[PDB]
Design a binder for this molecule. Structure first.
Ligand SMILES: Nc1nc2c(ncn2[C@@H]2O[C@H](COP(=O)(O)OP(=O)(O)OP(=O)(O)O)[C@@H](O)[C@H]2O)c(=O)[nH]1
Ligand SMILES: Nc1nc2c(ncn2[C@@H]2O[C@H](COP(=O)(O)OP(=O)(O)OP(=O)(O)O)[C@@H](O)[C@H]2O)c(=O)[nH]1
Ligand SMILES: Nc1nc2c(ncn2[C@@H]2O[C@H](COP(=O)(O)OP(=O)(O)O)[C@@H](O)[C@H]2O)c(=O)[nH]1
Ligand SMILES: [Mg+2]
Ligand SMILES: [Mg+2]
Lengths: 430, 95, 51, 439, 433
């Protein structure tokens, strides 16, 4: 009931889903063959949120994976839990976009989106009472940033009332792996601001920093990054699947965290995180959890909240605990850090409790916060974009398929206006 | 032998009082549960303990809690009753 | 003074009986009664049922 | 012959009704199945459970209650717990989509297709009883569905039934500790809705009960279960006069005749005593004098309001146990002659007292110890205006910049509805000090 | 019906309360559990019957270092005392008067006042308050003075008796005791009704000379003070030929409101080894009471006059043999009185003989006397301690410890002036017309 369907785009999105579905199947006790093997009753009542029942007693995720090249799908099918996916949900092209926003949004996008729109319409009409959509994709890739944005526009136009949630992987300045990042990133952000109900930013810089300095393991991997992202994203919707003292859903989080419709960019994290050699010395308590979580270093974005002010915040507590520690620590930190909290909205922290701890842990915390420090990402990427656009670099590759510089200019203007209005609230006073 | 839990306002240390929660209960029952180890300990959970969400793992049952309390009331008293004699207590050498 | 120690421990025990009245009047030799004995403080209560 | 219907809406309402019904079942001897035990085979005497339950003819007893929510998780938890066979399957009405802390959603769009079912079930329950005393409503005011459905239900009941008494045990947010961030809006709207539609309202904010639990029960980490148990104890003490014989009985109708001076002024505050743990309960005689002295202690309030800053208007207190009327009168005289407590000039005598014989019932696995004497006191004071005053400050401080207003406007509610709620709150505030000044 | 309330502050206060409340429990037969061992409202003065069975004492314990209190909570008498009348702080005053009187004593005094009000409301015939404190300590002297000041305005005319422990002339523990000794003297002079010297060197002498113990300890000292307290307060609860209340001290030993400092003594005090070699006549024990070497305060009565003496007899005494003893005392020339006091003896007699504590020190005896005497010789202790204060105040030693805790620099001056005025008053009263 109140189920959510899952759609992903690009190789980054496919790799994110390959780990997220593994984590969810492990949590719900689903074997790679798709047969229930749980140990408790509480693991089955709310399984229809992410799983569709089929004849033979097996469960299939209601996810559709798409890309413009078949290699990522041939790789993700063979991975663990890959047989869970219905082959009818795999929709792929034969050419590929090649890191070109226009190529993935206008030429092949229009002629390829029909089938994926058909299958997602079939899923949405089949489900009992749709709750909303969730997105995992990367903004630095051409096919992702184009097709995903176009599909978001189409599905938002077809279902205006349903909620929309996105996990964006914005390009990072220090560790960059392609030069066409500013163009497609700016265009994707411009298209996203008008349609995305919720947007969550993830940075490979932050993921690398966390995996290097917190877990202190020498050689990280995209598998570890995907594991961290999957745990963080499952912590958001855990309380939708399990009972607790205070229930909370995506709609409630949106209502409590977006004061204005054009301010829907957050920055998330996960806690607790500890190394193998240091997990036996730490003590798992609510003060420890909140102390680690409100640390700026733990954040999954390179944006430092201490350079801005928290417009609003929400913390999702997982596991059996007392309302004392939760509420008292929230009030205490809010009073002790009054300089980092905007004043014209009092008591701007939201809390929820889910009684089921994650497998392998006894307590956990998921935090989603809206702060005015996220604007530096847009500032830096727009500076790079305008610096490389002033000389008309790589512009022919975009203008050779019907795209004109008027669109680029309006994207620049809209993004700059967004940055300005988002910064104004930082200096706004009561 | 000690006494199997203490008076309310007793300052001091009660081993794992902050490590493994033990919320909601009065205090004498809490410190009784600490001196005599009836609690899981460790940063892990077997399947039996988890999937027991408040309303299911407490705020339920009919009299199983009642027979548990009388057993605890008996145990605490038989432990404490080991004291008698018209010689008061050795306060001089205990102090 | 009131016996408190007895009240705390034998509060839950309640004895219930079904009884019949014996008297000179003839109309009241058939109607039945329910007798309650509260042994917490030796209190006897009588209730009369109607067919 | 006397019956009362309890209404529970929202997560807080359901979670407190669960504790209330567990306490009632344990007090009347009802097993979770419904039969008294399977061992007592006489029964057929002392029909006092009829106030809260209803005989099915042979065996089990069904409560006279209805549960309302839009989030199905709590309803499924109730239907799955140990009380699965107790409640009627279709009086636990559950919605489909949650209101998600929005007043407009639960008042204009989603509440309409469930209010019909709720009213139908209410009519079915009301047709069974014959001496319906009144309705009780428990509502979490800080939740969207709770506030919206409470407002709609109260508005509908004010027309369908009319003169029947309704009692409101609302839970306003604590002055500094709260869970959500949008509670001032729907709190103010709910207050405006219930100002002209509730006969009696009682404050049940969480921080005060927290403070009581920490100091007396000596618990450092209590949870909502302890709060629900304390509130259920308060409700049981209030309602025990109906179904238990006593020296002085007080009914539901014996509140709006002896405790509320004016129709506009019915927002009140509650207190309970004694609260003590078994590990230190038996060292004190727990006399009626000391329990009624602790009852008037401002630190034992169930609402975060200090009566020392205002005047009293009417006080209703109920004693249960082995209390003596002469000791009651002596304690009343002592508290009257106490200087630190003052009454309003135009109310020379301000006490109504009822006495019940049944001592309070102790629940195994709870925190309270079993005792012999207890007092539950409801007083109307002018000082309650401060909670409305500070709640006004929070609302305007964020409404000046039109924060979150789009979330309410887009759900079909007129943008200007905040203004009349603010004016209603200002008028209610203005009324209180006018009464508070001397002639 | 008639009750007395005891106040204990500072670990000296608690470690005297332990001994005295052990002696009271043994005297009334109350078990350490608090249950009466089964078998006439004699216990009502010190204990309160809770409705069924146990009796809870009418006492409150105050301290800021929790170490001494935690022993009681973990001791054998854990079930006896009220869990919420053993008030314990967080940080001790650490031998600073200003700390416990202006900074950290304020947040704990309110709970003590609440508990005192709750306890006193239960009583119906409250007679007065008794206070035990250590003047030569931080929280004992600071907090206790604050409680005395607050009580003198909250309750007013209720009598207040004092048992304070002033430093010995040479045997001492700290260096800064003279500072916080002066300030507490200034506080108590205008706020307490009766004061009794309870120095430690004097009792050390009594133990060594009588009980034949070469290595005594504070616990041995505390038992003697408990015996003194019980002998003083016996008449309020046990039947006798002449009963005296605490208002018979407030009316017969204080000629003037300023002069209310007196001293205590006790006799006979003998070990069981040589207990059974003397007849211990009432004439013999009354002489040891007046013996200067038997004093419980480091004072020499031969260096001053007498004003009033109240001696309480308990045991198998007969009033006629009592009167002869006072006649012989008056006949004796080594003891002299003041001219303006022709009669100076108030005598009380009780039937209950003193009880002996198992594992104790004193022997079981059929007669004992406790004598509280007001004398002019008590002014000597003020002179020596004033000199000690002056020696280390000439150079402003340790002053910064006090100024930094919110106490004014000048406060040292007026407290000294009050002591000088007290010495002047005592020496002026001691003269003859
Ligand atoms: N005292 C107390 N308050 C509760 C309890 N449960 C919920 N609340 C209050 O309810 C507020 C949050 O709203 P909820 O009751 O959880 O949810 P709701 O009222 O059903 O509204 P929705 O969230 O839209 O479904 C909290 O701020 C609490 O103050 C409870 O068990 N005890
Ligand atoms: N005779 C006797 N004297 C004691 C006892 N306990 C403490 N004292 C005296 O107290 C003096 C020191 O002050 P304390 O009472 O110990 O400490 P305090 O008054 O609490 O002041 P702080 O140490 O700052 O907390 C010592 O010189 C002792 O003479 C006792 O049990 N018997
Ligand atoms: N976290 C994470 N990021 C990835 C992964 N694979 C690729 N990326 C990021 O995606 C960006 C490139 O995306 P791209 O391959 O062009 O996406 P595509 O155009 O949709 O195929 C790089 O900057 C990577 O940091 C992955 O497995 N995990
Ligand atoms: Mg809710
Ligand atoms: Mg000390």
């Amino acid at each position: 009931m109140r189920e959510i369907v899952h759609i992903q785009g690009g190789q980054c999105g496919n790799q994110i889903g390959a780990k997220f579905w593994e984590v969810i199947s492990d949590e719900h006790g689903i074997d790679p063959t798709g047969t229930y093997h749980g140990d408790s009753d509480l693991q089955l009542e709310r399984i229809n949120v992410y799983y569709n029942e089929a004849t033979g007693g097996r469960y299939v995720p209601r996810a559709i994976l798409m890309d413009l090249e078949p290699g990522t799908m041939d790789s993700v099918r063979a991975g663990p839990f890959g047989q869970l996916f219905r082959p009818d949900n795999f929709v792929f092209g034969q050419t590929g976009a090649g890191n070109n926003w226009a190529k993935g949004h206008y030429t092949e996008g229009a002629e390829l989106i029909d089938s994926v729109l058909d299958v997602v319409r079939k899923e949405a009409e089949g489900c009992d009472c749709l709750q909303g959509f969730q997105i995992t994709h990367s903004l630095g890739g051409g096919t992702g940033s184009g097709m995903g944005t176009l599909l978001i526009s189409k599905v938002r136009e077809e279902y205006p009332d349903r909620i929309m949630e996105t996990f964006s992987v914005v390009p990072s300045p220090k560790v960059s792996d392609t030069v066409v990042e500013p163009y497609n990133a700016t265009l994707s952000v411009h298209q996203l601001v008008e349609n995305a109900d919720e947007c969550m930013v993830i940075d490979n810089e932050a993921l690398y920093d966390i995996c290097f300095r917190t877990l202190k393991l020498t050689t990280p991997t995209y598998g570890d990054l995907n594991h961290l992202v999957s745990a963080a994203m499952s912590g958001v919707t855990c309380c939708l699947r399990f009972p607790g003292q205070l229930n909370s859903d995506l709609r409630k989080l949106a209502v409590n965290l977006i004061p204005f419709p054009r301010l829907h960019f957050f920055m998330i994290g996960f806690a607790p995180l500890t190394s193998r050699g240091s997990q036996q010395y730490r003590a798992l308590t609510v003060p420890e959890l909140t102390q680690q979580m409100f640390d700026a270093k733990n954040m999954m974005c390179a944006a430092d909240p201490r350079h801005g002010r928290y417009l609003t915040a929400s913390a999702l507590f997982r596991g059996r605990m007392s309302t004392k520690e939760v509420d008292e620590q929230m009030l205490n930190v809010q009073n002790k850090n009054s300089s980092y909290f905007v004043e014209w909205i009092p008591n701007n922290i939201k809390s929820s409790i889910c009684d089921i701890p994650p497998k392998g842990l006894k307590m956990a915390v998921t935090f989603v916060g809206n702060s005015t420090a996220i604007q530096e990402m847009f500032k830096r990427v727009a500076e790079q974009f305008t610096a490389m656009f002033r000389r008309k670099a790589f512009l022919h590759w975009y203008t050779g398929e019907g795209m004109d510089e008027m669109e680029f200019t309006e994207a620049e203007s809209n993004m700059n206006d967004l940055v300005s209005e988002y910064q104004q609230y930082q200096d706004a006073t009561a | 032998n000690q006494a199997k839990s203490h008076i309310p306002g007793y300052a001091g240390y009660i081993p794992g009082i902050r490590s493994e929660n033990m919320y909601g209960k009065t205090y004498g029952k809490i410190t009784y549960m600490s001196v005599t180890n009836q609690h899981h300990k460790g940063p892990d959970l077997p399947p039996d303990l988890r999937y027991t969400s408040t309303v299911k793992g407490e705020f339920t049952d009919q009299k199983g809690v009642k027979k548990q309390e009388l057993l605890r009331q008996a145990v605490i008293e038989e432990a404490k009753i080991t004291s008698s004699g018209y010689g008061s207590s050795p306060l001089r050498t205990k102090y | 003074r009131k016996d408190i120690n007895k009240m705390y421990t034998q509060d839950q025990y309640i004895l219930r009986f079904e009884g019949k009245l014996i008297s000179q009047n003839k109309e009241d030799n058939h109607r039945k009664f329910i007798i309650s004995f509260f042994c917490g403080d030796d209190t006897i209560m009588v209730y009369e049922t109607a067919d | 012959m006397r019956e009362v219907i309890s209404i529970h809406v929202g997560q807080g309402g359901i979670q407190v009704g669960n504790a209330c019904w567990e306490l009632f079942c344990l007090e009347h001897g009802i097993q979770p199945d419904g039969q008294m035990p399977s061992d007592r085979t006489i029964g057929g005497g002392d029909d006092a459970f009829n106030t809260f339950f209803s005989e099915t003819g042979a065996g089990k007893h069904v409560p006279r209650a209805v549960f309302l929510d839009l989030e199905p998780t709590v309803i499924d938890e109730v239907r799955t717990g140990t009380y699965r066979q107790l409640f009627h399957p279709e009086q636990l009405i559950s919605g489909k989509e949650d209101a998600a802390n929005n007043f407009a959603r639960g008042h204009y769009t989603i509440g309409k297709e469930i209010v019909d079912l709720c009213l139908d079930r209410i009519r079915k329950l009301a047709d069974n009883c014959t001496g319906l005393q009144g309705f009780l409503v428990f509502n979490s005011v800080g939740g969207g569905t709770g506030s919206g459905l409470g407002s709609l239900l109260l508005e509908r009941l004010s027309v369908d039934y009319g003169k029947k008494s309704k009692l409101g045990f609302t839970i306003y947010p604590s002055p500094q500790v709260s869970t959500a961030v949008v509670e001032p809006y729907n709190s103010i709207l709910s207050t405006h809705s219930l100002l002209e539609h509730t006969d009696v309202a009682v404050m049940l904010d969480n921080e005060a009960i927290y403070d009581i639990c920490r100091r007396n029960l000596d618990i450092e980490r209590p949870t909502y279960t302890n709060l629900n148990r304390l509130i259920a104890q308060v409700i049981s003490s209030l309602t025990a006069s109906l179904r238990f014989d006593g020296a002085l009985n007080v009914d539901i109708t014996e509140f709006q005749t002896n405790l509320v001076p004016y129709p506009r002024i019915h927002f009140m505050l509650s207190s309970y005593a004694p609260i003590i743990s078994a590990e230190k309960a038996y060292h004190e005689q727990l006399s009626v004098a000391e329990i009624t002295n602790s009852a008037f202690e401002p630190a034992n309030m169930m609402a975060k309001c200090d009566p020392r800053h205002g005047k009293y208007m009417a006080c209703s207190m109920m004693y249960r146990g082995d209390v003596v009327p002469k000791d009651v009168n002596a304690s009343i005289a002592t508290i009257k002659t106490k200087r630190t407590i003052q009454f309003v000039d135009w109310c020379p005598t301000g006490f109504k007292v009822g006495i019940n014989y049944q001592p309070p019932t102790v629940v195994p696995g709870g925190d309270l110890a079993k005792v012999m004497r207890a007092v539950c006191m409801i007083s109307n004071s002018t000082a309650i205006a401060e909670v409305f005053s500070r709640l006004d400050h929070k609302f305007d401080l964020m409404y000046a910049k039109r924060a979150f207003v789009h979330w309410y406007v887009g759900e079909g509610m007129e943008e200007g509805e905040f203004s009349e709620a603010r004016e209603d709150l200002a008028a209610l505030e203005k009324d209180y000090e006018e009464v508070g000044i001397e002639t």
